[PDB]
């Protein structure tokens with residue numbers, strides 16, 4: 001029913017974009033949903049870093065002091081787009097600071113160092129299985145996971161699975177209350193998503209998000225929890241990809257898809 005209210009505008013939006021758009025949006029009050037290509041796999045790109053921080057927070061529930069552990073690293077850890085960790089190369093950073101940098105600045109060195117602590121891509125995948133997500137898979141590290149090859153299931157999930165897992169971690173019971181609020185707070189402080197889902201959200205609504213940009217195959221994404229005033233929160237995921245390696249992603253398309261999802265849910269804004 002709501003999936004059909006916006007099916008036609010979604011098709012026109014993705015045809016103008018020149019690729020595929022995948023959207024799943026959930027109104028946590030009524031349970032109403034909007035779907036468009038919601039079961040197709042899309043590359044995660046940096047969006048896995050949000051789930052990575054949730055996995056760290058989950059581990060901190062039964063390993064006190066994990067968040068305060070100092071991590072030291074060498075120049076060889078600094079891969080492109082490590083804007084925070086490059087400033088602390090000579091000092092180290094704590095696990096919590098690496099997690100905040102991974103979430104709020106998409107810091108690649110920070111993400112790789114945290115992946116190391118959790119047992120690599122299989123360890124993060126294992127965490128996702130532990131919360132009931134059978135779709136998510138991480139296979140590689142930054143930046144190899146950005147290849148976004150058409151048809152390749154490595155380092156992908158579906159918009160529906162991303163939304164379902166995000167709901168469990170931010171609003172459900174997958175994390176304990178203090179860890180859940182810390183995860184929400186990190187997403188709320190993200191600096192990389194101002195032109196994506198946030199561009200669709202009114203100023204007086206709270207929003208936390210995590211972005212991903214593979215840099216090839218028109219592949220980019222964003223997922224978010226949105227707290228409209230006066231109603232229950234909305235969880236949504238917007239993923240894109242395109243057939244040609246040189247196709248460019250579009251933040252404006254991500255924002256436009258988020259607007260249609262919110263319009264479909266009847267969320268005025």
Ligand SMILES: Cc1cc(Br)c2c(CP(=O)(O)O)cc(=O)oc2c1
Pocket residue numbers: 077112113116141142143144
């Ligand atoms: C910190 C760290 C640890 C590892 Br175990 C890797 C790997 C696996 P490898 O391909 O180097 O063996 C790839 C990478 O880009 O970064 C890492 C960063």
Ligand SMILES: Cc1cc(Br)c2c(CP(=O)(O)O)cc(=O)oc2c1
Pocket residue numbers: 055058059118123124126127130
């Ligand atoms: C990285 C990570 C963190 C956790 Br918190 C798990 C859990 C929950 P646990 O029962 O091991 O304590 C299960 C799992 O299979 O993988 C994980 C991976």
Ligand SMILES: Cc1cc(Br)c2c(CP(=O)(O)O)cc(=O)oc2c1
Pocket residue numbers: 045046047080081105106107108192211212213214215
């Ligand atoms: C090499 C590189 C790494 C990142 Br980490 C980005 C991001 C951040 P994200 O969207 O992946 O979170 C945005 C971007 O436009 O280009 C990038 C290029």
